[PDB]
Amino acid sequence: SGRLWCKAIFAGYKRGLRNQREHTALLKIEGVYARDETEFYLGKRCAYVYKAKNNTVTPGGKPNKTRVIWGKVTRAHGNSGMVRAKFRSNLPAKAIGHRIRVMLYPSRI
Amino acid sequence: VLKKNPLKNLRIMLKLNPYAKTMRRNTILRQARNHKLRVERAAAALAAKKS
Amino acid sequence: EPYIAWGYPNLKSVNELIYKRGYGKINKKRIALTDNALIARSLGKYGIICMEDLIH
Amino acid sequence: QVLVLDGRGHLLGRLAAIVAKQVLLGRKVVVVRCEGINISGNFYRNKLKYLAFLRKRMNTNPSRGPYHFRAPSRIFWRTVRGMLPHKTKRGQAALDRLKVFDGIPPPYDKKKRMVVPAALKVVRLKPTRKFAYLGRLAHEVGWKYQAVTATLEEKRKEKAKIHYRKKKQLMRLRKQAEKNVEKKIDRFTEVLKTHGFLV
Amino acid sequence: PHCSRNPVLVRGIGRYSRSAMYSRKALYKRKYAAPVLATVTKPVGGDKNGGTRVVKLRKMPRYYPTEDVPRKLLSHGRKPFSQHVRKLRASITPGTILIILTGRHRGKRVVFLKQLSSGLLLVTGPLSLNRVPLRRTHQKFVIATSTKIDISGVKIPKHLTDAYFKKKQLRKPRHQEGEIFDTEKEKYEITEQRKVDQKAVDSQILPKIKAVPQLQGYLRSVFALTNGVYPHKLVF
RNA sequence: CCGCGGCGGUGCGCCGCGACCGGCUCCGGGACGGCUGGGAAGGCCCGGCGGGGAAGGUGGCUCGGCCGAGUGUUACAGCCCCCCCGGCAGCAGCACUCGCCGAAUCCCGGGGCCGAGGGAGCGAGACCCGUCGCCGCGCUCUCCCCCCUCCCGGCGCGCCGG
RNA sequence: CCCCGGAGCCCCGCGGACGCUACGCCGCGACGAGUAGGAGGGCCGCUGCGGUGAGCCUUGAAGCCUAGGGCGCGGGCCCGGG
RNA sequence: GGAGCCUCGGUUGGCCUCGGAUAGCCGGUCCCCCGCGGGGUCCGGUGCGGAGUGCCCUUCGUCCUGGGAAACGGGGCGCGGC
Ligand SMILES: [Mg+2]
Ligand SMILES: [Mg+2]
Ligand SMILES: [Mg+2]
C-alpha cells in the first residue's frame, strides 16, 4: 500500500570529460554516499518509468500510457556512493535529473 | 581448445599436474589439524585463567 | 632500463605466470599449454615432459 | 521536496558550488537572506574585485555588455550561474529550479530553512581571517534597497520571536503533560526506550 | 551397494588417498582371476494364407526432408532443471518471516513453511490474517526478516508439493476462430481440497503466531518505504 | 483423433528463473614461514646497583575551605622513570589490529558484473549415440559388522526386520 | 581361434561426406594508422559486339517518382506501389 | 455532476526564534525593573547537543462481534460570526 522502491536520480551517463559512453547510466541513489553504503544495491532491478502519448499494454493490467526501461545496478561508481547502472536500452537524456526507481527485488537479504 | 584456468579449475590443474591432488589434500588436513590445536591451546588458557 | 620493470621472481610467480598464462610456441603458433602432450612433444628431448618440469 | 537555505553565515562561492550540483540533480532550491552571505578576504579586497567586474563592458554598446547585478540575491545567482552549463537547455533548466532572495519573503519566512555547514564561515575560515558581508559590498556598488531590506527583517524577527515564545509555551506544557500522565503512558514509554529513544 | 568409502574433504577432494583406499576397499583379496544373414534379428508376427509374415518394428521412413541440421558436440555438464542442486539463503529458516516483494501480495508479510522440490519457497501469511494463502514464492523476491515463530512441530501435508501448486488450464483445438474459445472459462476456482489444506495448516501455525505479542498485527500490516528510511541503513 | 511418448529443429510478442563453464571485480573465514630464530608489550614477582625528573615531603609566597589548589628550591624514595646485573610458563608479526616481508612456507567458502557461439551420424533385417584425456571416487562381481532410520512388512508414539 | 552384403560401430586398411563450384570446402596461429605512390580483388557500375538464358515484355519494356520491404563493409543491388 | 483529446513531473508531511562560536540551550525565580509577556541578577538542570534534522509528526490492508486499557474526540469538501 506504499512505496516498494528506493529513490534515485539519473546523474548522467558514464563518461570521460569529452567522451560520454551512453550505454552506462550513473545513479545517485538517495541516502547513500560511500563506496561502502552501496553493496546493498549491487544487482538490483531498476526502472526508468515514464509516460507517453500513445497507449501501451501492461502486465496484469489494462492498457496504459506509462512505459518503462528496465535495468540493473552493476557496480559502485567512485567513493561518494554513486552507482553504475546498465539498462536494457540506453536511457533517453531527456531523463537527466529525473527519478529512476531502484527496486529491492533481486534480494540477497 | 578453450583454456580453462588451472588455478581455478581443480581438474585442469590435475590434468596438467596430478601431484596437486595430494598437495591440496594435505593443506586442508594440515590446516584443520592446526586449527583444532589452536582451540585446544585456547581452552587450556581459559582453564588456566579460571584456575 | 627506463623501458622496463624487472627483478627476481618468486616461486609462486613462476607458477602463476606459467599456469594462468603459459603458452607454447608450437610450429610458430602461440598455443595454450592445455596438456603436457604439447610440452613433451616439443621439450621432451630435454627430459622436460610436463608443466611441472618446465617450472623447475 | 524543496531546499530552503539561509544564505547567512555561508561563503559565496562555497555555497554556490553546493547549490549548483543540487540544482543539476533536479533538486529545487531556494536561497534566502542572500545579503547575509559573506565572502572571505577583507572587505576592501572584494570591493575592488567587484569594481573591476563593473569596468568590464562592451565598449561599442554597454547596453549589450555584461550586466552587473547589484542586489545580493542576483549576485549570488550570478555566481551559481557560473557553475552550471547555462548555455545548454539542461543548464537553463537547472537555474530555473534555483530561487534567490534578498532577505526572507513570505513563503519561506514561515518555513524551517537549512544550513550547509560545508559552506559556513565559522567552519571554513580561520577566525583571525577577514571577510566581507555581501550586503555592504552590494550597498556600496549601488544596491538600492539595503535599508528597506533591514526594516522588513526587523519586522520578521519580531514576528518570529512571538512564534517561538508560543512554541516554547507548548513544549513546556508538553513536558508538564508527560509528568501529569506518566503512570498511564508508563508501559508505552518503557518500550520506546528498549529500542533506544528517550535516553 | 555400499556407500562412499572415502568421505568428502572438499568438492572434488576425497579425504583419503589412492593408497588408503586400496586398503579400505581391500583390493588385496578381491582379485578377479578371469581368463544377420538368415537368422532375423528383431521383427516377427503371425497371419493366414501363404504362411506367416515377417513384419519390421521401427520401419524406415516415408519422407526425408531436403536438408536437416547435423547433431551437436556432447557438452559435459549441462543438467536439466530437475537434476539441479537447490540453494537457500541461510537467513530463510522454517517458521521465519518474509516480506514478499513482487506479486499481488506485494509488501504483505508472511510466514515461511518449506522449500519445495523446485527450489521455490512454500509460504503462508495465514489467509486469516493477511489474505495470503498456501503459496509458492522465490527466495530472490522476498526479504528474510529477522523475526521467527517456532514452527518446529507442525505436520505440513506431504501431499502438498510443487506439483500441486501448479497452474492448470487450456488445451489446443476447439472452435477457435471467431469471438470465442478460452478468452472465457473466466475464473480460477479455489476448489475444496485447497481450502481444506489451508484450514489444516493455518490452525497449527495460527496458535503459534498468536503466542508472540503483537505478531498477528505485524502480520496484518504491509511494508513500505517512507521518507528518510533507506533499505541499506535499516535491518530486516 | 488422443497421447505434448522418443528425436529433431521453434518460441507471435513481452518476461522471469535455474544450475554449468569462461573472464573479471570484490567480501568473509581460517592455516603457515622468516626476522635482532623479530622489536616492543603484558603478567608474576624477588634480590640488588646506581643516575634523573621531580614528591605522600619540606619551604617562601599566593588563592580557596589543619585540609584542598597554584608557583619556587635541595633532592633521598614512601609518584614514577632510566641504566646495570639474574629468571620465570603466555606467547603468537597478537582482535588490547603499536610498527614487516612473504606462501609448494596456502587453503576454504561467498557475493556483483559481462559473456556462452563451436557443433568428430544423410546405412540397406540389428543405437538416431555416445563421448577423448583427467579426477577419483563410488559401487559392485569379497566377506564382516555398527548405526541411524525413508519406503514397505511386523510387533509393542516406541521397538524389530530399503 | 570361422565370413562385416553384416564387427555393429570412437575405427573400421571391403565402400565411402550432409562436405568435394578442389579457382571448392575445412582447421589452427598471428596481425589491421596512412598522403605521394604501387599491386590485388570487385556476383560494383555504363554503352556495343559473339555466344547463351525454349529469359522477360501491351495481362505493360525503358525511364521517372516514392515518410513502402530488404540485402550488401562498400561500389551498388533486388523487390512493393505510383 | 458525466464523458474526452493532450502535457507531464511526482509516489507522507515538517506551520518559522535570534544568533553565538575563546561559547551556547532550558528552566525557575525567592528578588528587582519595564510594556499575560520583555530585561536583569541569583540559583537549579542539560552541553560531542535526546526540548537531538544522528531529529520530529503521521501510519500502511477492509470489515464483523465482544472484552479489557484509553474515552468526548472525529466527521458531514457540515454550516454562520470574530
Ligand atoms: Mg591499412
Ligand atoms: Mg593514394
Ligand atoms: Mg504513476
Tab-separated table of N, CA and C (backbone and C1' of nucleotides) and ligand atoms in Angstrom, chain A residues 49 51 66 101, chain H residues 9-11, ligand 3:
chain	number	residue	atom	x	y	z
A	49	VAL	N	10.843	5.098	-15.476
A	49	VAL	CA	9.405	4.918	-15.619
A	49	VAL	C	8.758	6.215	-16.038
A	51	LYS	N	5.827	8.206	-19.022
A	51	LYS	CA	4.597	8.044	-19.778
A	51	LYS	C	4.608	8.837	-21.060
A	66	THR	N	1.818	4.800	-19.360
A	66	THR	CA	3.160	4.661	-18.785
A	66	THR	C	3.946	3.512	-19.426
A	101	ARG	N	13.711	4.299	-10.346
A	101	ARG	CA	13.329	3.562	-9.161
A	101	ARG	C	14.297	2.420	-9.041
H	9	G	P	8.431	14.264	-18.792
H	9	G	O5'	8.854	14.284	-17.257
H	9	G	C5'	8.052	13.700	-16.203
H	9	G	C4'	8.133	14.597	-14.992
H	9	G	C3'	8.465	13.972	-13.653
H	9	G	O3'	9.782	13.455	-13.536
H	9	G	C1'	6.963	15.772	-13.378
H	10	G	P	10.138	12.457	-12.337
H	10	G	O5'	9.310	13.054	-11.117
H	10	G	C5'	9.088	12.295	-9.921
H	10	G	C4'	8.139	13.044	-9.023
H	10	G	C3'	7.604	12.263	-7.834
H	10	G	O3'	8.487	12.337	-6.727
H	10	G	C1'	5.815	13.294	-8.956
H	11	U	P	9.254	11.033	-6.243
H	11	U	O5'	8.102	10.161	-5.571
H	11	U	C5'	7.413	10.628	-4.401
H	11	U	C4'	6.178	9.794	-4.156
H	11	U	C3'	6.432	8.371	-3.661
H	11	U	O3'	5.630	8.044	-2.537
H	11	U	C1'	4.884	8.360	-5.441
I	3	MG	MG	2.013	6.521	-11.785
